[PDB]
Amino acid sequence: MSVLISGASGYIAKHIVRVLLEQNYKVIGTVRSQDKADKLLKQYNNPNLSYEIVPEIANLDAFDDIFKKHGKEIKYVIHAASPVNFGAKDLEKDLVIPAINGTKNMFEAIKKYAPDTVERVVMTASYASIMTPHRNNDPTLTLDEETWNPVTEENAYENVVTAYCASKTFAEKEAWKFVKENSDAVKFKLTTIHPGFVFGPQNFDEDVTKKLNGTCEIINGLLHAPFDTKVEKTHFCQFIDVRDVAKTHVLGFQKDELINQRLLLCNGAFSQQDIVNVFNEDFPELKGQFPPEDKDTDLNKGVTGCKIDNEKTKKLLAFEFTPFHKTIHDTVYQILHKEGRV
Ligand SMILES: NC(=O)c1ccc[n+]([C@@H]2O[C@H](COP(=O)([O-])OP(=O)(O)OC[C@H]3O[C@@H](n4cnc5c(N)ncnc54)[C@H](OP(=O)(O)O)[C@@H]3O)[C@@H](O)[C@H]2O)c1
């Protein structure tokens, strides 16, 4: 009945492991080093948790050793490992290759060592594999769970943004191709999850560092910006709360109606200024210690960019998503409280 989760040291994955342990699952995470495994075991202090070391998901047959050891006990797989940080001049090596190869490696290990034992795979894709980046600001485009990012391998590396979005798109395409080509050989059913920009508190307070890795540094950077910093008030993207994402991953292998589904996890548009506005409304005593409030944002003028049709996703998951204001508030409170400022 064990659950394997790849990339278990990350921002989203630490919340997923929390949820799994809340529900009494035995959990095997993969992390890059013994260092990280040791630190995590001390943070969770839970005997149902263990880690295996996978230093590089891109390398040959990277997940085989896990299934040679645990193949008989792994019933569910959450494939969450894909690069979010990467060298801007190593867009294949650091980004597209590990995204794709990590996915192929996970699925091929299941096929080779546990084709009839693994029942469900839940893969973290992205809003990036559904949306068209250059139409982020186009309200005449409506996206739903069947829409695909049309980026080509030829044009994928326009910039770091298109390249990351292509890494998610190409990896997810390979995932569905595998499931189509192996429906007779392997038992597992695939569910993919497609978060927008993920915000919300770190799973552990102690992991709030001066500079955050990943998407929450958007918030943390604005929170510490000098008062006179120029803040953009134009549409940035869609967001989703990390705790909604984590809850969805676990439902993803539990609920029969999520089999073969792409789940579009966005809950609203924002600009940098909409984030800053929460600072000023919710922590008025600190006004002046970060950039000021300005209600003139795209969002407040009814400008939210390409449209999100995720009614099917919301109906299947059934639970209400966390509103933007709370997600930002909880992120900011955790930082300011850790700093002793509130
Ligand atoms: N807004 C978001 O944050 C967002 C939105 C949509 C989808 N996602 C997807 O959610 C998943 C986790 O993202 P995150 O935001 O939680 O970022 P994160 O904190 O950087 O987590 C990424 C995890 O994957 C590991 N990883 C990445 N590349 C690896 C590689 N080549 N080999 C071995 N391990 C590797 C990382 O380990 P190390 O840190 O040790 O390298 C880490 O454990 C990813 O699949 C991401 O594409 C994120």
XYZ file of C-alpha atoms and ligand atoms in Angstrom:
390
model
C 0.000 0.000 0.000
C 3.056 2.292 -0.102
C 3.160 5.535 -2.084
C 6.297 6.509 -4.007
C 6.829 10.225 -4.674
C 9.679 11.518 -6.854
C 11.318 14.842 -5.993
C 10.133 14.718 -2.401
C 12.270 17.614 -1.091
C 10.460 20.272 -3.127
C 7.976 22.964 -2.155
C 4.869 21.186 -3.453
C 6.089 17.674 -2.627
C 6.697 18.420 1.059
C 3.007 19.347 1.352
C 2.009 16.174 -0.524
C 4.050 14.053 1.893
C 2.370 15.853 4.801
C -1.068 14.944 3.411
C -0.022 11.336 2.785
C 1.182 11.015 6.373
C -1.998 12.633 7.708
C -3.843 9.737 6.030
C -1.526 7.041 7.459
C 0.127 6.059 4.173
C 3.557 4.515 4.098
C 5.580 6.948 1.963
C 8.821 6.467 -0.001
C 10.222 9.765 -1.288
C 13.134 10.217 -3.700
C 15.678 12.974 -3.078
C 19.014 13.842 -4.634
C 21.320 13.325 -1.644
C 21.669 11.666 1.741
C 21.940 15.191 3.223
C 18.423 16.071 2.163
C 17.019 12.677 3.158
C 18.485 13.014 6.661
C 17.144 16.561 7.127
C 13.665 15.608 5.921
C 13.427 12.542 8.140
C 14.161 14.790 11.115
C 11.541 17.330 10.006
C 8.690 14.835 9.661
C 9.783 12.505 12.501
C 7.368 9.849 11.238
C 8.206 6.113 11.035
C 5.924 5.675 7.985
C 8.346 7.861 5.978
C 11.519 6.785 4.194
C 13.661 8.090 1.345
C 15.612 6.592 -1.513
C 18.362 8.527 -3.264
C 17.875 9.387 -6.938
C 20.599 11.948 -7.703
C 19.556 12.689 -11.288
C 16.210 11.753 -12.829
C 17.670 12.229 -16.327
C 20.271 9.464 -15.988
C 19.904 5.943 -17.388
C 17.086 3.951 -15.765
C 17.152 6.359 -12.814
C 14.216 4.761 -10.950
C 15.042 1.074 -11.525
C 16.825 0.528 -8.188
C 13.771 1.754 -6.265
C 11.513 -0.785 -7.961
C 14.083 -3.562 -7.676
C 13.920 -2.958 -3.901
C 10.287 -1.882 -3.365
C 8.462 -3.030 -6.503
C 6.206 -5.412 -4.577
C 5.024 -2.781 -2.073
C 4.457 0.345 -4.223
C 0.768 0.668 -5.114
C 0.683 4.364 -6.026
C 3.240 6.659 -7.642
C 3.258 10.470 -7.536
C 5.722 11.651 -10.175
C 6.461 15.219 -9.062
C 10.177 15.580 -9.965
C 10.904 18.045 -12.789
C 13.342 20.986 -12.897
C 12.115 24.415 -11.876
C 15.600 25.939 -11.476
C 18.102 25.657 -14.327
C 20.975 27.322 -16.146
C 19.582 29.844 -18.625
C 22.203 28.730 -21.184
C 21.692 24.996 -20.614
C 18.040 24.845 -21.604
C 18.191 21.268 -22.875
C 20.560 19.775 -20.296
C 19.065 21.420 -17.215
C 15.411 21.590 -18.247
C 13.896 19.701 -21.148
C 16.035 16.553 -20.911
C 15.413 15.887 -17.179
C 11.699 16.662 -17.494
C 11.230 14.169 -20.322
C 13.774 11.537 -19.302
C 12.642 11.506 -15.675
C 9.126 10.742 -16.878
C 10.254 8.011 -19.267
C 12.465 6.548 -16.529
C 9.631 6.385 -13.993
C 7.130 4.812 -16.379
C 9.630 2.296 -17.789
C 10.689 1.199 -14.291
C 7.048 0.515 -13.406
C 6.579 -1.437 -16.642
C 9.771 -3.437 -16.064
C 9.491 -4.219 -12.337
C 5.876 -3.732 -11.249
C 3.591 -3.700 -14.320
C 0.700 -5.374 -12.482
C 1.345 -3.931 -8.987
C 1.264 -0.149 -9.466
C -2.384 0.896 -9.741
C -2.162 4.670 -10.198
C 0.345 7.281 -11.320
C -0.341 10.947 -10.548
C 2.012 13.219 -12.486
C 2.658 16.904 -11.758
C 2.344 18.578 -15.143
C 1.580 22.292 -15.277
C -0.797 24.953 -16.421
C 2.190 25.457 -18.746
C 1.243 22.359 -20.785
C -2.322 23.637 -21.322
C -1.809 27.351 -21.962
C -0.135 29.195 -24.832
C 2.492 31.503 -23.279
C 2.289 34.273 -25.869
C -1.515 34.381 -25.414
C -1.328 34.798 -21.615
C -2.934 38.244 -22.058
C -5.484 37.272 -24.718
C -9.059 37.097 -23.330
C -10.371 35.611 -26.604
C -8.565 32.333 -25.806
C -10.413 29.960 -23.472
C -8.427 27.043 -22.037
C -9.849 23.795 -20.692
C -8.607 20.367 -19.632
C -8.298 19.206 -23.259
C -6.263 22.200 -24.489
C -2.550 21.758 -25.192
C 0.339 24.199 -25.361
C 1.128 24.103 -29.122
C 4.860 24.843 -28.712
C 7.107 22.937 -31.122
C 10.522 21.493 -30.389
C 11.895 23.892 -33.017
C 10.501 27.004 -31.312
C 10.529 25.853 -27.682
C 13.687 27.720 -26.641
C 12.664 31.286 -27.514
C 13.415 32.206 -23.874
C 13.569 30.603 -20.435
C 9.789 30.860 -20.054
C 8.869 29.116 -23.286
C 11.569 26.524 -22.578
C 10.244 25.649 -19.126
C 6.686 25.483 -20.465
C 7.886 23.210 -23.277
C 9.672 20.960 -20.765
C 6.330 20.402 -19.023
C 4.424 19.994 -22.304
C 6.871 17.525 -23.856
C 7.159 15.450 -20.686
C 3.378 15.220 -20.351
C 2.997 14.269 -24.029
C 5.473 11.432 -23.485
C 3.490 10.315 -20.421
C 0.216 9.994 -22.325
C 2.009 8.350 -25.255
C 3.391 5.709 -22.888
C -0.021 5.023 -21.366
C -1.576 4.648 -24.819
C 1.169 2.329 -26.064
C 1.229 0.138 -22.910
C -2.440 -0.082 -21.886
C -2.234 -3.884 -22.120
C 1.225 -4.307 -20.561
C 0.876 -2.101 -17.467
C -2.080 -1.813 -15.130
C -1.651 1.727 -13.880
C -3.980 4.589 -14.781
C -2.586 8.102 -15.212
C -3.864 11.402 -13.800
C -2.062 14.679 -14.510
C -2.255 17.837 -12.407
C -1.752 21.279 -13.956
C -1.088 24.033 -11.391
C -0.769 27.693 -12.235
C 1.843 29.689 -10.306
C 1.873 27.987 -6.901
C 1.792 30.201 -3.791
C 1.203 29.499 -0.118
C 3.311 28.835 2.979
C 6.270 26.478 3.035
C 5.338 23.173 4.640
C 7.842 23.816 7.454
C 8.388 27.260 8.984
C 12.143 26.571 9.198
C 12.359 26.329 5.410
C 11.510 30.034 5.082
C 14.894 31.436 4.033
C 15.943 34.960 3.069
C 15.642 33.990 -0.607
C 13.086 31.342 -1.476
C 13.594 28.963 -4.343
C 10.783 28.758 -6.819
C 7.564 30.622 -7.313
C 7.071 31.923 -3.771
C 10.150 34.127 -4.232
C 7.823 36.316 -6.314
C 5.978 37.111 -3.085
C 9.027 37.126 -0.808
C 10.926 39.431 -3.159
C 8.073 41.932 -3.360
C 7.642 41.778 0.421
C 11.251 42.899 0.960
C 11.452 45.340 -1.949
C 12.360 48.959 -1.173
C 9.314 51.198 -0.859
C 10.128 53.032 -4.113
C 10.409 49.852 -6.207
C 8.513 49.898 -9.492
C 5.813 47.219 -9.235
C 4.041 45.883 -12.311
C 0.245 46.275 -12.309
C -0.377 44.347 -15.551
C -1.642 40.762 -15.656
C 1.051 38.283 -14.637
C -0.582 34.826 -14.675
C -2.964 32.452 -12.867
C -2.187 31.215 -9.341
C -3.160 28.242 -7.179
C -2.626 27.498 -3.482
C 0.045 24.878 -2.744
C -2.267 23.205 -0.241
C -4.942 22.752 -2.919
C -2.281 21.259 -5.198
C -1.162 18.811 -2.511
C -4.721 17.758 -1.661
C -5.417 17.203 -5.362
C -2.395 14.940 -5.875
C -3.581 12.557 -3.156
C -7.184 12.544 -4.391
C -5.622 11.830 -7.769
C -4.872 8.203 -6.918
C -7.882 7.662 -4.616
C -10.860 8.745 -6.747
C -11.954 6.564 -9.655
C -13.401 9.558 -11.512
C -9.922 11.110 -11.785
C -8.624 8.212 -13.896
C -7.315 9.452 -17.263
C -8.031 13.086 -16.349
C -6.015 16.259 -16.818
C -6.846 18.509 -13.849
C -6.529 22.259 -14.416
C -5.571 23.902 -11.103
C -5.922 27.676 -11.482
C -7.978 29.885 -9.190
C -7.476 33.445 -10.403
C -5.377 36.022 -12.215
C -2.964 38.438 -10.531
C -0.326 41.098 -11.094
C 2.632 41.881 -8.861
C 0.635 44.851 -7.579
C -2.296 42.637 -6.547
C 0.167 40.722 -4.358
C 1.558 43.953 -2.902
C -1.977 45.201 -2.217
C -2.466 42.301 0.203
C 0.656 43.380 2.138
C -0.814 46.826 2.682
C -4.396 45.794 3.428
C -3.532 42.988 5.836
C -0.447 44.384 7.630
C -1.193 48.126 7.711
C 1.132 48.638 10.672
C 4.075 47.796 8.372
C 3.118 50.210 5.566
C 6.242 51.856 4.195
C 8.387 48.740 4.761
C 7.330 47.455 1.335
C 5.910 49.062 -1.843
C 2.569 50.869 -1.494
C -1.007 49.942 -2.333
C -2.435 50.790 -5.760
C -5.889 49.550 -6.742
C -5.250 50.283 -10.445
C -4.402 46.756 -11.576
C -5.474 44.751 -14.613
C -7.442 42.435 -12.307
C -9.402 45.283 -10.731
C -10.292 46.618 -14.202
C -11.718 43.224 -15.200
C -8.577 42.208 -17.099
C -7.490 38.627 -16.411
C -5.967 37.393 -19.679
C -6.739 34.070 -21.266
C -9.808 32.444 -19.770
C -9.827 29.351 -17.556
C -12.606 26.827 -18.179
C -11.853 24.327 -15.402
C -15.441 23.592 -14.381
C -14.871 19.900 -15.072
C -11.821 19.889 -12.796
C -13.682 21.683 -10.014
C -16.653 19.333 -10.288
C -14.473 16.199 -10.185
C -12.398 17.400 -7.214
C -15.492 18.810 -5.469
C -13.614 20.829 -2.829
C -13.500 24.638 -2.934
C -10.174 26.177 -3.964
C -8.399 28.633 -1.649
C -8.966 32.312 -2.582
C -6.073 34.499 -3.703
C -6.249 36.870 -0.731
C -5.845 34.033 1.775
C -3.049 32.370 -0.185
C -1.042 35.590 -0.232
C -1.928 36.404 3.380
C -0.776 32.993 4.647
C 2.457 33.167 2.640
C 3.253 36.634 3.971
C 2.285 35.864 7.567
C 4.624 32.875 7.677
C 7.555 35.004 6.507
C 6.856 38.040 8.694
C 6.161 35.865 11.735
C 9.393 33.902 11.236
C 11.223 37.253 11.030
C 9.689 38.293 14.351
C 7.818 41.206 12.755
C 4.242 40.046 13.484
N 4.272 27.262 -9.632
C 4.938 26.061 -9.328
O 5.731 26.032 -8.422
C 4.572 24.902 -10.239
C 3.526 25.045 -11.117
C 3.196 24.029 -11.942
C 3.922 22.851 -11.887
N 4.974 22.717 -11.037
C 5.710 21.456 -11.026
O 5.687 20.922 -9.528
C 6.727 20.122 -9.365
C 7.533 20.628 -8.140
O 7.794 21.983 -8.342
P 8.146 22.959 -7.070
O 7.487 24.295 -7.326
O 7.839 22.303 -5.759
O 9.734 23.275 -7.200
P 10.922 22.609 -6.329
O 10.827 23.030 -4.875
O 12.213 23.070 -6.988
O 10.740 20.981 -6.364
C 11.303 20.283 -7.452
C 11.679 18.848 -6.965
O 12.076 18.099 -7.986
C 13.623 17.747 -7.790
N 14.250 17.794 -9.094
C 14.175 18.661 -10.115
N 14.972 18.247 -11.098
C 15.535 17.104 -10.677
C 16.428 16.270 -11.296
N 16.965 16.491 -12.607
N 16.879 15.176 -10.694
C 16.438 14.881 -9.451
N 15.558 15.698 -8.828
C 15.102 16.813 -9.447
C 14.046 18.697 -6.967
O 15.199 18.229 -6.188
P 16.413 19.283 -5.880
O 15.905 20.571 -5.276
O 17.373 18.547 -4.970
O 17.092 19.617 -7.197
C 12.868 18.913 -5.995
O 12.807 17.912 -5.068
C 7.520 20.177 -10.687
O 7.190 19.106 -11.500
C 7.009 21.500 -11.286
O 7.280 21.523 -12.737
C 5.295 23.732 -10.205
